[PDB]
Each structure stands twice: as C-alpha cells, then as structure tokens.
C-alpha cells in the first residue's frame, strides 16, 4: 500500500532562452550538497488534474529559466555555472490508495521520501534536473505535491516563494516579477559552523553511512506558552529539541543554526542568503541544561559566519555537517500555495544530503498558532527522541 505507478514527464520554459550562462554565487555553491523536499497536501484533487497543474509551469519557468537549466563547469586559468539550455523540470505522476488524512496523522517514518522524487545532483551531473515535482493522487480524492529542489539553485525562501508564483499563475493572478538580473560574481580557514569534506567530483551528495531518517511533530500553542511561562518561539522549540537530542547523543554543546531572515534578503528570487552561525553550550551540559537558557543562548549568543561560509573554497556540508543545526524558516509562506482557492491542509519540509549530525527545521502550521518541526536523525535515534520529546 505504498505510492505507485510513477510516470514522468518534462516541462520547459515557453520561450527558448538560447546561449545564456547563469552565474551562481559562492553562497549558492556553498549549499551544493543539500536538497529540500517540500510536500504540500490538499483536501481536494478536484479540478487539479495533471494538465491544469502542468500548463502554468511553462510561463513560470520563463521567469525562472535557470531552474530549467542544468549544471556545467567552466575551466580555470573550475567553477560551476548553470547552462541556460532548457532541460526543464521533471514531473512525476503517482497515486496512493491511502487516505491522506490517515497518513498525515500516522507519524510515519519516511513518507516525506515517498511523496517526493528520490534524486540529487548525481552521477549524471550534466543532465540532472535541479527541480522535480511529484503529483500524488490518493483514493480520498487527495493530492500531495512533493517538490525535490536542489539547494544550489536557491535557499528555502527562494524555493518556497517561486513555487507559489506558480500557484499564483495557476489560479489566474499575476505574480510580482522575478529578480535575477544583478549577476553573481565570485569573491581562508574551514569555518566552524560548516564542515570540510573531500573533493566532491560529479555526485554532489555526501553518503551518510548510518542511515538517516525523516520525522516530524506538531508543537501546539499551548506548549507554545508553557514555553513562555518558564528570545522568540523558534529558538525555544529549537532549544527544546537541541537538548532532547543531547540526552540522546550527548556531544551537543556546539550547534550551528540556519536563519531565513527577510532583513538580509537581496530581493533576488534565485539567491542563497540564509545566514549561518555557531552556538556553543560552554556554561554547562545542553543535556544538563534547562531549556529556557539554551533558548536564551540561541538569541544573543548567535555568531555571524555566513559571509565566511560562501568565501570557503572547497566542498562543505552545513546542515548536519559539523554540529547539529536548527532551522529558521518558521516565517516562510508555505500555506500560500493556493491552488486557485484551495490552500493546503498540511505542509512539511524534509531534506536530504545533510550529514550525520542531523538537522531540525522549524516552520509554521496551518493556523500560524504553533509550529511544525521536521528532524533529520540517525534512524535508530528517533526511536528514543519520540520518547524523549513525549514528556515535553
């Protein structure tokens, strides 16, 4: 009773772009080994047949033509760029005789990976799509859109706001224009918030070794205020799990944390300006720490390493590379994915390509009242953290 009958298609930009190179920043190249897996669930599959979902993608990818390109490497006197050839994004059609409501309230290990396509910048580097969209119908009349999006292309505000310009397209409203016309140009020691790993050739995914797994949890507004009654919300439920993971593994005094702050955003829609920085529990054990102070720790004891990560020459892995890394995205328009009138019942984001340190993404819920948090863990580890969190 898994999801079945995949049959895949391509969509391209409506105009042919031509000889055109998209130079990507070194902040782009800094995340070349990480991949977002966003899945949006919809009560109704009604009126959203595959041609209605596919048809708007053509005008959409004329505004976002570099995501329909593929990767090449220039020679040195080897920095990679996006060949402006319209390879297009692959669309995967699949169904599941599951009722979607059943499956979202299941706490299922690995459904994020069942409803988004499984592939990364990989062995065939020069013909690998930057984006895949999988359309999964259910027998409930439900429909989940799982997007497999390379982080090299763009950050998560960039990923999430381009997908909804697509939904703005579909429903007949006019998106506000794409911005990529200030071109990206290039620019020490291994920054501590990231982690060095060996020359990466043509498959840009670091094998984790010990099998990682997705899982996520609702934290409601009631626990949102016992949070209060004990630094904003995201770094206290960031702090919640940071120590919870620390009684799981122990060596959890360093942690880096990813920030989707709109105040540092260039305005350009295909960028990579999420801000990167270390956290260290010097005073005492995070496993021995009371949550209200590691929360206090993750607000002002923040360290700006973002400028230095992009200037790193060499392959690094930041989410789950060096420390555990918490995720700042709670303020990203994920329930703006309005299919004409329908906005989702459920949105959850996963990831892969994140090292064995694990990572936790902190992002909003349907009501804007609590939060949803996805945790990447060494799979043997979610056994206990679910108990570990169950008290909280």
């Amino acid at each position: 009773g898994a999801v079945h009958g995949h049959r895949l298609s391509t969509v391209v930009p409506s105009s042919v772009t031509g000889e055109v190179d998209y130079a990507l920043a070194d902040a782009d190249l800094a995340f070349k080994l990480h991949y977002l897996r966003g899945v949006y669930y919809y009560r109704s599959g009604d009126g959203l047949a595959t041609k209605v979902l596919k048809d708007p993608m053509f005008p959409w990818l004329d505004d976002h033509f570099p995501v329909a390109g593929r990767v090449r490497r220039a020679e040195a006197e080897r920095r990679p760029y996006i060949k402006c050839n319209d390879c297009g994004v692959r669309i995967v059609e699949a169904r599941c005789d599951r009722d979607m409501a059943e499956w979202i309230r299941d706490a299922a290990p690995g459904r994020i990976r069942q409803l988004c396509y499984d592939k990364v910048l990989g062995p065939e580097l020069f013909f690998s799509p930057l984006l895949y969209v999988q359309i999964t119908n259910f027998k409930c009349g439900g429909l989940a859109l799982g997007f497999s999006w390379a982080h090299l292309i763009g950050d998560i505000p960039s990923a999430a706001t381009c997908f909804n310009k697509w939904a703005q397209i579909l429903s007949g409203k006019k998106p506000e224009a794409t911005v990529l016309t200030p071109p990206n140009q290039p620019l020490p020691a291994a920054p501590r918030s990231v982690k060095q790993v060996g020359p990466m050739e043509d498959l840009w995914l670091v094998p984790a070794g010990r099998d990682m797994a997705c899982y996520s949890f609702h934290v409601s507004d009631a626990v949102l205020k016992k949070l209060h009654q004990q630094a904003g919300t995201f770094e206290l439920v960031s702090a919640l799990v940071w120590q919870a993971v620390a009684k799981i593994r122990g060596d959890v005094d360093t942690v880096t944390v990813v920030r989707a702050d709109a105040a540092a955003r260039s305005g350009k829609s295909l960028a990579n300006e999420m801000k990167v920085g270390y956290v260290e529990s010097a005073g005492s054990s995070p496993a021995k720490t009371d949550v209200a102070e590691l929360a206090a720790l993750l607000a002002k004891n923040v360290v700006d390493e973002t400028a230095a990560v992009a200037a790193f020459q060499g392959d690094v892995l930041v989410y789950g590379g060096a420390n555990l890394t918490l995720v700042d995205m709670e303020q990203v328009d994920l329930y703006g994915l309005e299919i004409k009138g329908q906005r989702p019942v459920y949105v959850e984001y996963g990831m892969d390509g994140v090292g064995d340190e694990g990572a936790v993404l902190v992002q909003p819920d349907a009501d804007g009242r609590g939060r949803l948090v996805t945790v990447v863990l060494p799979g043997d580890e979610i056994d206990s953290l679910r108990a570990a969190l169950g008290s909280a």
Binding site: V11, V12, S14, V16, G18, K51, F58
Partner: protein
C-alpha cells in the same frame, strides 16, 4: 488548440468563398448555446463563446482592412522594413519540403502540401519558425501560403501574419522563440500528429518526438532513427537562432532610431 484530432470546424475554405453564411453560423451557434445552458452543459455553453470569437476574428479581418488598409506609409509588416532578412533560397526550399528537422514544423508542412489546409496553431508553428528561426523574408512564406492554402484569404492572411510577427498590439512577442516542446504540449500532447504525418518518427517515444536532436543516441537507434539519413538534422539550431534574433533586432532598432 489540439491538432492531433479534428477539433475545429474545417469550415475555413467554405467561408472564404461565401459558400456558407456566417450569419447562419452565428444564429445556429447562439441557439445551440441556449439549449446547452438550459441543459446544464456549462463546458459546451462555454465552447460556443470561444467559437464565435473565432468567427469574430474573421469579422476583425475585414474591420482592419476597411478602416486601416495598408499600401505605402504603413504597408503590411512596415515595422520590419528594416529587418536583415536571410535571403537563402536553399533554406526556403527546405522549409517548403518539410525537411527542417523540426517534426511539428515538418509534419504541418507536409499536410499543407498534401491537403491544402492547416490547423490554426500549426499555421503559426510553421510561420513563427519561418521568420524567427530561419528568419527569411516574411513576404516569401506569405506567397507560399497564398499558393498552397485553399482558404487563402486576403484580409485573414494579413491578420494571421501580423499576429505572429508582432506587427500590432494584439500580436505575439517579438524577441522570443517558442520552445518546440511548448508547442508540442499545447498542440500535440501524445505526438500523434507528427507520427501520422512523419511515419519515420513513429517509434520515437513521445518525450523526444518534438525535439529528436536532444535525444540520446541509444534512444534514436532504438526507434530506428539516424539523424542526417533517416530524418534530417535541425537545419538551424535554436541557440544559434535567438542569438541571430538579437543581432538582427537591435541592428534594426539601431536603424530605427537613426531615421
């Protein structure tokens, strides 16, 4: 928009010779609209709306020729007076014989010679291609349409070219070339239109059928296709053509602001 089936009325040459009263078409369709509306058939009701719009385009065809006729100060396609046309009779002949290597272009170019008729959207595919890819004198492909269309209509041919060249505000965007897979997906989702007119490509899977030159050699041979001998190679490449498009349009806008 589909061309893989008989989706339009095929009343085109009849209406040009006044063999069928458009006023009768109007009255009958309008009354068909009323019955369907009363039958809860909204899609069908919506359909006559668009079909009458297609009738109105023929009205607008005479409107533009009565009100804004064109002889000398703004003749037809006056805006590209200053265009550097590729004068290449070889390329013209390859467009005529449907040997361009672009299936949807070649398919439609065969049917045009075969049955003296073409679907509207295929009328633009082989025309957009003639002026934006091969970039030959639009006056040239106009005279071919005049000789090989049964519904060869002075005003409506005028409107149709003005539309694809961008000669008037309703028209199509100029510095821009349609990706063939865009055309194919709108006008031929399963590639059955060109499989029918180019049986050479019958075994080419639908994914590549509108752009065979981007297919892996292993797929081309599995379909028994060998580009250059079995089915032609793309006479002009797209990249080399939008490039040429910029070099031809700004050269002309440079010529434009210089007079």
């Amino acid at each position: 928009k589909k061309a893989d089936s008989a989706s339009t009325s095929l009343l085109s040459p009849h209406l040009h010779f006044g063999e069928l009263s458009v006023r009768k078409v109007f009255h009958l369709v309008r009354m068909k609209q009323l019955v369907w509306s009363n039958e809860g058939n909204h899609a069908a009701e919506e359909s006559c709306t668009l079909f009458l719009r297609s009738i109105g385009l023929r009205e607008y065809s005479r409107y533009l020729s009565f009100n804004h006729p064109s002889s000398h100060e703004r003749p037809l396609l006056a805006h590209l007076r200053f265009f550097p046309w590729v004068v290449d009779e070889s390329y013209f002949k390859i467009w005529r014989q449907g040997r361009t290597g672009y299936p949807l272009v070649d398919a439609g170019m065969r049917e045009l010679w075969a049955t003296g008729w073409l679907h509207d959207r295929i009328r633009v595919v082989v025309a957009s291609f003639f002026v934006k890819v091969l970039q030959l004198p639009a006056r040239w492909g106009m005279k071919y349409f005049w000789d090989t269309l049964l519904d060869a209509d002075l005003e409506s041919d005028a409107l149709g070219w003005q539309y694809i060249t961008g000669s008037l505000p309703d028209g199509r965007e100029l510095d821009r070339i349609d990706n063939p897979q865009f055309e194919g997906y709108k006008f031929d989702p399963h590639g059955e239109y060109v499989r029918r007119w180019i049986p050479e490509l019958a075994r080419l899977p639908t994914e590549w059928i509108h752009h065979p030159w981007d297919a892996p050699v292993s797929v081309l041979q599995a379909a028994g296709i060998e580009l250059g001998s079995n089915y032609p190679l793309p006479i002009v490449e797209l990249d080399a053509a939008k490039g040429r498009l910029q070099a031809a349009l700004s050269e002309m806008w440079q010529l434009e602001a210089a007079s």
